[PDB]
Amino acid sequence: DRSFRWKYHQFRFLCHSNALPSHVKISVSRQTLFEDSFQQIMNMKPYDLRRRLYIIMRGEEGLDYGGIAREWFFLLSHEVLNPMYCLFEYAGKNNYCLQINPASSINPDHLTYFRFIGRFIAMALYHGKFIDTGFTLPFYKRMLNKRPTLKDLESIDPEFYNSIVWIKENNLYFIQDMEILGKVTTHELKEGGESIRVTEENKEEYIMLLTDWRFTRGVEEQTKAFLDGFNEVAPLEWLRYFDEKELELMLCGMQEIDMSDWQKSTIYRHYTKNSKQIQWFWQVVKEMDNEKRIRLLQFVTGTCRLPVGGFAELIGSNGPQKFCIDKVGKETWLPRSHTCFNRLDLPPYKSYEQLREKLLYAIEETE
Amino acid sequence: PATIMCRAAADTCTFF
Ligand SMILES: *CC(=O)Nc1ccc(NC(=O)C*)cc1
């Protein structure tokens, strides 16, 4: 049970202890970037991708192979999302909740394209460089073989989350119809699922099955193919010690956070800017290392990534939704977040050295 | 060797 700090050099050592000498050349034109890099890497052997990376990007003055590489990661991480590849989509407006497009099958060769990205992420992490694709946190849980919780459902599909909340909070068969490009199929949630009816005792089991299905619907093989290519280069077992939020910070890297811009673009409900709690809140957020501030930002928004322009342009489901605090819950409770709303529920805590504790615990030991 | 650990630590010190 060590710190994120320890987990990096023990993981970063784990990469180096398998790094190969020499180098590997990658000749690409920024026009044919995708189709070059794809045909490049997929025709290559996996572990050659641990050698020094030389990215020959045809028509160059560049010689700082560090800059072209880091540049290449940024540019390719964006370009894989190109909708003419039919690979990804977003559940909400304004590019919210990046998820696999279940119609990738339209490309009979798509599974390889996903395998490729697995190889690519592994390269990006094995060579300790950063990207800007903007994956969901549940994505990382699947990479960690963690099951995603109901809180995750709140983040990605509010109406679907708020549906099941009703079922658990009141009192069907084990199937789920799914329209795949017109044609619809009835997925048996279990064996004989079409015949078995929902009971109060079966609901406990039943609710889980949906929670898992919502994530693993029509993306079961795209995921299985993706994970194979990543495993082919770097074992997922290497990430056994990490969690969802630690992992995202590895792939995107840490930034300094504009502490001013945060306070200047934070909106409140029930609370006001000159409340005891908030004037304490920014007290705690100041005597804080950058490591936690992102972890906090991760806790509330569901992503360490900042979109263009700062906290002002912060997006949730249903459109822009700036950083928001609310006087919610009992002060015998922890403060909890609503990442679809980019909203923090903060109880009226009667002491500074109580808020400080209660806050950090929510960030540390909850999601 | 152990120079690997003596380079992993430097990778964390730098990156984070
Ligand atoms: C053997 C050894 O400790 N090398 C080493 C590791 C880490 C750092 N710190 C940074 O690079 C910031 C220096 C030297």
Residue numbers in the entry:
A (entry chain A): 492 to 662, 670 to 865
B (entry chain C): 2 to 17
Which sentences from the paper describe this structure?
Here, we report a general and rapid method for discovering α-helically constrained (Helicon) polypeptides that cooperatively induce the interaction between two target proteins without relying on previously known binders or an intrinsic affinity between the proteins. We show that Helicons are capable of binding every major class of E3 ubiquitin ligases, which are of great biological and therapeutic interest but remain largely intractable to targeting by small molecules. In addition to possessing increased stability and membrane permeability, Helicons are capable of binding large, flat protein surfaces that are inaccessible to targeting by small molecules, and Helicons have been developed to target a range of PPI targets in cells and in vivo. Characterizing Helicon-E3 co-structures and mechanisms of action, we identified new binding sites for α-helices on the E3 surfaces, as well as potential probes of the disease-linked E3, WWP123,24, highlighting the generality of our approach against this therapeutically important target class.
First, we focused on the NEDD4-like E3 ligases, which make up approximately a third of the HECT family. These include WWP1 and WWP2, which each consist of four tandem WW domains and a catalytic HECT domain at the C-terminus that transfers ubiquitin from a bound E2 first to itself and subsequently to the target substrate. Group 2 Helicons, the pan-HECT group including C73, bind both HECT domains, while Group 3 Helicons, the WWP2-HECT group including C72, bind only the WWP2 HECT domain (WWP2HECT). We next solved the crystal structures of five Helicons, four in complex with WWP2HECT representing all three groups of HECT-binding clusters, and one from Group 1 with WWP1HECT. These structures revealed three distinct Helicon binding sites on WWP2HECT. In all of the structures, we found that the HECT domains adopted similarly closed (inhibited) conformations. The WWP2 proteins in the co-structures with H301, H305, and H308 share a low root-mean-square deviation (RMSD = 0.5–0.8 Å) and are shown overlaid. Group 3 Helicon H305 binds a similar location near the interface of the N- and C-lobes of WWP2HECT, with binding residues predominantly in contact with the C-lobe. Consistent with their ability to impact the catalytic activity of WWP2HECT, H301 binds near the E2 interface, while H305 and H308 may restrict the conformational change involved in activating this domain. We found that individual Helicons from all three HECT-binding Groups (1–3) could modestly inhibit the auto-ubiquitylation activity of the isolated WWP2HECT.
